[PDB]
Design a protein around this ligand. Structure first.
Ligand code: BR
Ligand code: BR
Ligand code: BR
Ligand code: BR
Ligand code: BR
Ligand code: BR
Ligand code: BR
Ligand code: BR
Ligand code: BR
Lengths: 339, 339, 339
């Protein structure tokens, strides 16, 4: 909630407390796991009027896990999700630097709209598909003011030489283009980047460059939300083989995600969805699925501050998946206070 | 401090900075330890009017330790203490889920009122006696509106299969009942829960179920505060033997806690107390004390934002306690800014 | 931003999001390193009117690193920087206890004014030169009201027996005196403290007492800022030898730091600086430099909420420094949103 506007600056300290429990059969061979998954968020989002053609802004957001004891495990799952600052200059564009959303998420955002799950391909610290560190992002709305509805972005991703290959990346460049009109939206995004010597020393994966792309289509108007994403990747999508205790990236994946939702006046928002990501040319296994489910779920909004929800993952992953991916369904039930 | 009310929601971001030092003789064989114990708290507490019969609410609260260097020990003692959200429906009751106070703390709260120490039996992540993860809590004030002063609660505790037996728990159920009138209060609470295979593989403890109960009596009115708790436990109270480098739970404990306090108009709040928890049927030791002291202490309130305090623990634990429990007294001196 | 004043208390929750990147040649043999260094800060600062001669106050401030993945490295560089509470009584002085600035920083503060780097001798958890835990600090402005411009302080540092010698300290006492008038300022500060048995078991260092002192001169007025610090140390300044994989403290250091800055009306603030700390009588090496550079940098302030900056470290450290200290220059470029 905007707790502060004076002079020319408004600051919004914000958060949520999310009482959350997953129900699976027993969580080891499941999709989401089983048990308490309670967490909270806290952040600030700020914007200052420097002059009439120029604003400056910043954002930070942290995740606190609520499902750890107060002993030595207390920090498990705690992390900063965003931290960046930027300037936006009238007709010219915005420029921000920090930990932000990777630019292909401009497409994956179309379907990442389920109450609890969804967005399975938007991995954190995975080049351009999710949140990631060290990106410079330029964004332009309405093509310099000359074409209403036509937007684009470019993003420079700095090398992050980390101790895990899963969380590292080389230097890279990505971009996105979107056009909206009378409720319809279409988007494409693509990015490529160098892979580190660590990522390459691993078994799964082969190549010195990583590539991700996705297109998105969506209808959003008259209480209806429909959206579809299609995407591929090379040497980008992290994957593990749990039988040989093995890990790396899938040389190839192709991905589809569909979502349909309606929002009633009284506050019920039903959702259905479908998602499948299939890895290909995986060293030692061949073609294999990483994600494959239908979803049914719903969110009840009491108001802008309070919601409850249920999310049910009908998992079509099969019982002999050669990487060991989980076969059982998961339900999540949620109660959220936010401000 | 309420930093935000608008529409129908009020949010209180809150905290304290607590300059705190313990004085013992040398801290190894003491009650509280010796040295700097500075810390801060930060949280939000929120409540939204959904309609005239229904409110939604949430709370989060974190502890930052102020007595760690800025190097690799910097996270020591940092943790989320609370994180939950709920709804409260008029005459019907409240329901919240998340990390919250266990329901037998509804009784132990009577005596957990000392400036620095006290509440020795309200262990964190120990079934129903302190803060704990994965509880669903229902609470009813004034018996549906039909009996002023008569309150009750029930709590469902979900299994937390953690890597330490100290911080794990099985599934369980607990409850409390209280009646207050013209300044007097009486309360009882009880809970039981399954113990994990980890808790059971340990030496101290025997049984596949954990049980805790306590009653409370208190007088609170005319600047006087008097309160008394009595409690027992089986396979619930965590305990260590420091000679054999051994740990587990005490098959039995019985506990007493008494407190007397007066609050002067000018801001001095003197306190005296007594506490003893005795473990029984402990494998290899027999009956032994875990806690045994008198306390004298006082808090000076300058106003609702500033206090200072001293707390002195006259430790009756004896010099040959067979678990090694500390024999020396501890003094704490404190300076607190809070908002 | 002051988000809260009512009754007699005002609370300022505050922070910044700092998009930050370092450019060195390749970061291993450099001054600052290379890559993303994004971070955020968050804190509260509060002050309550207890009466007309007495205020109470508190402060907490945390650092969140923005350059870590969301996996297991997520906590790297996260820490509390300050946490203390105190009272200030009219003409008599202030007294605070907690994690605060060590008192010789009252002198080193004169030159710690560069956009990104600078203040190389104000080490964290290093007795009196930087931030440190367990200090009681008394401060007096204007000599009890009797001498405008003449200020002083005394600080008691409690032993911190930590697991690293780098972050530990013995008991100690330090102080500072300053006089300002018509834009000029002069300051001296000194402190000494016992060293732990851990600090002494290390190779580099010899002695059971640690000592730090510095004087400061500064001119600050008419948009001009000039300042100079001189300082020495014994058994205080932490140092590593990277060839023998060795660490400890330098028995002796002498240090100089100079800064010149001008602030234009339109918001450009150019800076130049020079810094050299030379360690002496180092076991096995003799006399050697720890820090030696010129700096050129500038900060552009759009307003009180937004800035950008560049900081360039022309490193005079030489290519065969016997401890291995880095020889290459570093540039930092920064974009800061703050409130
Ligand atoms: Br937690
Ligand atoms: Br992820
Ligand atoms: Br990051
Ligand atoms: Br700390
Ligand atoms: Br505890
Ligand atoms: Br928890
Ligand atoms: Br980060
Ligand atoms: Br440091
Ligand atoms: Br500290």
């Amino acid at each position: 909630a905007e707790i502060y506007n004076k002079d020319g600056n408004k600051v919004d300290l914000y958060g949520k407390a999310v009482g959350l429990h997953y129900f699976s059969k027993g969580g080891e061979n499941s999709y989401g796991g089983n048990g308490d998954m309670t967490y909270a968020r806290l952040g600030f989002k700020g914007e200052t009027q420097i002059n009439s053609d120029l604003t400056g802004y910043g954002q930070w957001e942290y995740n606190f896990q609520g499902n750890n004891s107060e002993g030595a495990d207390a920090q498990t799952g705690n992390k900063t999700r965003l931290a960046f600052a930027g300037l936006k200059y009238a007709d010219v564009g915005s420029f921000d630097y920090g930990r932000n959303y990777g630019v292909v998420y401009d497409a994956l955002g179309y379907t990442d709209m389920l109450p609890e799950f969804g967005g399975d391909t938007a991995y954190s610290d995975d080049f351009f598909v999710g949140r990631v560190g060290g990106v410079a992002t330029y964004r332009n709305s309405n093509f310099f003011g000359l074409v209403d509805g036509l937007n684009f972005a470019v993003q420079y991703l700095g090398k992050n030489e980390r101790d895990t290959a899963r969380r590292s990346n080389g230097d890279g460049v990505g971009g996105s283009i979107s056009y909206e009109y009378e409720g319809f939206g279409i988007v494409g995004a693509y990015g490529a980047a160098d892979r580190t010597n660590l990522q390459e020393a691993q078994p799964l994966g082969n190549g010195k460059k990583a590539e991700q792309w996705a297109t998105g289509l969506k209808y959003d108007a008259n209480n209806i939300y429909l959206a579809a994403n299609y995407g591929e990747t090379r040497n980008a999508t992290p994957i593990t083989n749990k039988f040989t205790n093995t890990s790396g990236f899938a040389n190839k994946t192709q991905d589809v995600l569909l979502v349909a939702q309606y929002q009633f006046d009284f506050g019920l928002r039903p959702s259905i969805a479908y998602t499948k990501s299939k890895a290909k040319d995986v060293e030692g296994i061949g073609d294999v699925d990483l994600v494959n489910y239908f979803e049914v779920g719903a969110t009840y909004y009491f108001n802008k501050n309070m919601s409850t929800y249920v999310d049910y993952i009908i998992n079509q992953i099969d019982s002999d998946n050669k990487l060991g991916v989980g076969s059982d369904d998961t339900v999540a039930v949620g109660i959220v206070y936010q401000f």
